[PDB]
Structure 1
Amino acid sequence: AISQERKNEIIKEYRVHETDTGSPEVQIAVLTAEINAVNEHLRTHKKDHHSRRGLLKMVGRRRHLLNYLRSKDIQRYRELIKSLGIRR
């Protein structure tokens, strides 16, 4: 939808430390949850324009940040991709 409760719950395990709120690992995780949610609703409703526009924008941003973490660090990319089971 999403909900602040489940968001705040899931970010605690993926945050790099307790006090942080950025750390795109957090962002990649919440974006992945968001894209699955919107994709389920978009399969529920085949025709619309805001949904697919949104999905494309968030996928683009997720890829941009995922590529950003590919140059800052090299293990983080791997641990996230095989933990979220994403970016084949």
Structure 2
Amino acid sequence: AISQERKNEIIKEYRVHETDTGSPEVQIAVLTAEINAVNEHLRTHKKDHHSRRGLLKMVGRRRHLLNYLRSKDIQRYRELIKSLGIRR
């Protein structure tokens, strides 16, 4: 999808001083952008069915990260919804 330095501005401004990836709020944000980044490739490539399930698996792994966000995060749960473009 987006290049390492072409989508590192989101992490840096949303992560703590560490300059690295793997954070639950960083992974969810970097995965949501990937879906929107591969959204243009989901149009033309609609005849194929070996990548449509791939996004579902990506959302499935994101569920676990979102499950920890519903644990004890109230202000950190709406921070990745009012800033980006999603539901809830």
- Shorter-chain TM-score tier: 0.7 to 0.9
**Matched residue of 1:61: which SS?**
helix
Give, in whole Å, the separation in 2 of the partners of 1:87 and 1:16. Answer: 25
Tell me, which stretches of 5 or more residues in structure 1 are unaligned?
none
CA displacement, residues 19-65 of structure 1 (integer Å, 9 cap, x when unaligned) = 45322211111101111122221112112123212110111222221
The alpha-carbon deviation at position 2 of structure 1 amounts to 2.8
Give the superposed CA RMSD: 1.8
The sequence identity of aligned pairs, in percent, is 100
TM-score, structure 1 normalization: 0.81
Tell me, which stretches of 5 or more residues in structure 2 are unaligned?
none
Give, in whole Å, the separation in 1 of the partners of 2:24 and 2:87. Answer: 15
Give, in whole Å, the separation in 2 of the partners of 1:6 and 1:46. Answer: 26
The alpha-carbon deviation at position 78 of structure 1 amounts to 1.4
TM-score, structure 2 normalization: 0.81
Give, in whole Å, the separation in 2 of the partners of 1:50 and 1:16. Answer: 37
Give, in whole Å, the separation in 1 of the partners of 2:9 and 2:68. Answer: 25
Q: How does 1:60-79 map to 2 (within 5 A)?
A: 60-79=60-79
